[PDB]
Amino acid sequence: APDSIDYRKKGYVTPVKNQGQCGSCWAFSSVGALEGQLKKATGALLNLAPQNLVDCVSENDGCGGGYMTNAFQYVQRNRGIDSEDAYPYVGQDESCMYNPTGKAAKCRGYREIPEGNEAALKRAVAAVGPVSVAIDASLTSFQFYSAGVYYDENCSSDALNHAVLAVGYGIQAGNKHWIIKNSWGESWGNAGYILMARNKNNACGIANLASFPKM
Numbered sequence: 001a002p003d004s005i006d007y008r009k010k011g012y013v014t015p016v017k018n019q020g021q022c023g024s025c026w027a028f029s030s031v032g033a034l035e036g037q038l039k040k041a042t043g044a045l046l047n048l049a050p051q052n053l054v055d056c057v058s059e060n061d062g063c064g065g066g067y068m069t070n071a072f073q074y075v076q077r078n079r080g081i082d083s084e085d086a087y088p089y090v091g092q093d094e095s096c097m098y099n100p101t102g103k104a105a106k107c108r109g110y111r112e113i114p115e116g117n118e119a120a121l122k123r124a125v126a127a128v129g130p131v132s133v134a135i136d137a138s139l140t141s142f143q144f145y146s147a148g149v150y151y152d153e154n155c156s157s158d159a160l161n162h163a164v165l166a167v168g169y170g171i172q173a174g175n176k177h178w179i180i181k182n183s184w185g186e187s188w189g190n191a192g193y194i195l196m197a198r199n200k201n202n203a204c205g206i207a208n209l210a211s212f213p214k215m
């Protein structure tokens with residue numbers, strides 16, 4: 001397994017999106033992982049529809065929140081998910097309006113990373129590509145982030161409240177990190193991205209609820 005990798009340089013990651021005033025972070029984390037798998041399997045990078053997930057996953061709560069595992073299971077049972085063009089993101093809860101003519105990808109299940117194992121999460125990123133992860137993003141230091149490797153001793157490993165995408169890992173000035181793609185727009189952080197502490201006792205619970213789709 002490599003010491004460092006950035007999937008953005010391989011063309012596996014789509015531009016940073018903005019979820020707006022809707023707790024649909026799980027939907028953006030889900031499509032991000034599916035977009036990476038679609039690019040590996042077909043060679044084409046396309047924007048998938050998070051709105052398709054907020055409106056249709058009955059096991060989730062739409063703009064009220066949800067889980068990535070439930071999103072993947074829906075895509076599997078539905079035998080598809082729409083592209084962003086075929087099902088536009090509006091940031092609100094609406095009825096399921098899935099269009100089969102706009103289908104851009106599907107998945108055949110998911111696999112979870114062993115709880116709390118950052119080494120297993122590292123091997124998963126190196127071998128499969130972008131992985132959906134859950135973190136504690138409640139702190140003020142997270143909201144106002146800009147440059148450097150993020151670490152805060154007050155970050156909880158048990159209070160998971162946000163979903164993001166791990167697109168790689170590296171080392172910045174002696175500190176090991178995870179390249180994290182957020183869904184709060186380009187005005188946030190470092191052009192929508194955040195470098196989170198790697199191998200610092202599972203900081204912010206980064207390896208507590210990680211998963212990737214199977215194609």
Ligand SMILES: *C(N)CNC(=O)[C@H](CC(C)C)N[C@@H](c1ccc(-c2ccc(S(N)(=O)=O)cc2)cc1)C(F)(F)F
Nearest residue numbers: 023024025026059060061064065066134160161162163
């Ligand atoms: C992102 N913008 C908001 N955060 C979340 O959605 C987080 C995500 C990570 C994975 C922790 N999840 C929430 C959450 C999970 C589940 C529900 C929920 C689902 C389904 C129902 S229903 N429709 O059956 O009544 C109700 C609630 C809400 C939020 C949390 F709480 F952090 F675990």
